[PDB]
Design a protein around this nucleic acid. Structure first.
Ligand code: NA
Ligand code: NA
Ligand code: NA
Length: 323
DNA sequence: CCGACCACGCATCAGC
DNA sequence: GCTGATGCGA
DNA sequence: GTCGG
């Protein structure tokens, strides 16, 4: 209610930049602006007021001035009514259909889910799955269902080999009340950066008990697919969900878990901090920095805490990593 | 003024 | 056939 | 689009 009109406006602008104009950096600029504004504890009264926040520049300030004075933004109103642009933007909501595919589909008259349905031969495997679960994929996942999903994942993984180590990351691990998907990081003592079907066997067991229902992509270290909780007789059917499974070398596992648990703000801050202490932390490792800025060999990591110890930072619970 | 910004593994395309 | 680029959603 | 070297 505070600045929702402003944040929706910026978010909508972001989407058109990404999906229609294919300007990913403007996309992020608008989102960044929208985020900082979403956190501002005051109802913005002018573009000048908003420009004081990091991420809001001259143009977004001008756009806010227009929105506040007229209650709308001419450019956005025009874009919304544009048949071509609104269709391109809409099609990208289908997983598998990015800005490029959406643009090509619209160029040849394919503009709706209905048109996609009757042009199956023009969709790749991923896109067909995205169309099939269009609705389910836009629904969020309540934490209670995420817990039920975790139960199955951890149970089957252990059933395949009790030596596997699996961790469900994402906002879920930080305690979020709802998730958009499930991200499982996996490792095994037999797989390290130096020596090594570890992923395949887990994916297969999950398909055998009918938890995983579809495959978007699958290689030796990353699986992206679809899964669904079993429903009891009578009870309605749970919606299909997106699930990713990543096999990560044991010696890089904890740097992986840290990264994939975030938040993104927390990662940026933790990385920034590390640099201060003379360390460079990435998704895979934490390495010391020489006085001339040269990175040394990766330091041994056997828990998230080790990472924190290295940079002399107190261990913070996942729940307390909002930033 | 003008370049950074920019998760990377897997599916599929463009080219040889 | 293979190699590298591109699209895509992480 | 915004920031900043
Ligand atoms: Na600003
Ligand atoms: Na899409
Ligand atoms: Na090539």
């Amino acid at each position: 209610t505070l600045n929702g009109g402003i944040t929706d406006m910026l978010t909508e602008l972001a989407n058109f930049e990404k999906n229609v104009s294919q300007a990913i950096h403007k996309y992020n600029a608008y989102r960044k602006a929208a985020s900082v504004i979403a956190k501002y504890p005051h109802k913005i009264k002018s573009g000048a007021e908003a420009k004081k926040l990091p991420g809001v520049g001259t143009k977004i300030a001008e756009k806010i001035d227009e929105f506040l004075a007229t209650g709308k933004l001419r450019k956005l109103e025009k874009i919304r009514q544009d048949d071509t642009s609104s269709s391109i933007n809409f099609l990208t909501r289908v997983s598998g259909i990015g800005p490029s595919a959406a643009r090509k589909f619209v160029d040849e008259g394919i503009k709706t889910l209905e048109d996609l349905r009757k042009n199956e031969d023009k969709l790749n495997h991923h896109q067909r799955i995205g169309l099939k679960y269009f609705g389910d994929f836009e629904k969020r996942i309540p934490r209670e269902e995420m817990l039920q999903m975790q139960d199955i994942v951890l149970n089957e993984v252990k059933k395949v080999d009790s030596e596997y180590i699996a961790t469900v990351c994402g906002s879920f691990r930080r305690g979020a009340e709802s998730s958009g998907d499930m991200d499982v990081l996996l490792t095994h003592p037999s797989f390290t950066s130096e020596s090594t079907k570890l992923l395949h066997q887990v994916v297969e067991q999950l398909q055998k008990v009918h938890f995983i229902t579809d495959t978007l992509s699958k290689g030796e270290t990353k699986f992206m697919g679809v899964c669904q909780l079993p429903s009891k007789n009578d009870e309605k059917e749970y919606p299909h969900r997106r699930i990713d499974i990543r096999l990560i070398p044991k010696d890089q596992y904890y740097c992986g878990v840290l990264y994939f648990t975030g938040s993104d703000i927390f990662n940026k801050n933790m990385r920034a901090h590390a640099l201060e202490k003379g360390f460079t932390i990435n998704e895979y490792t934490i390495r010391p920095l020489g006085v001339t800025g040269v990175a040394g060999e990766p330091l041994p990591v056997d828990s998230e805490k080790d990472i924190f110890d290295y940079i002399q930072w107190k261990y913070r619970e996942p729940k307390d990593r909002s930033e």
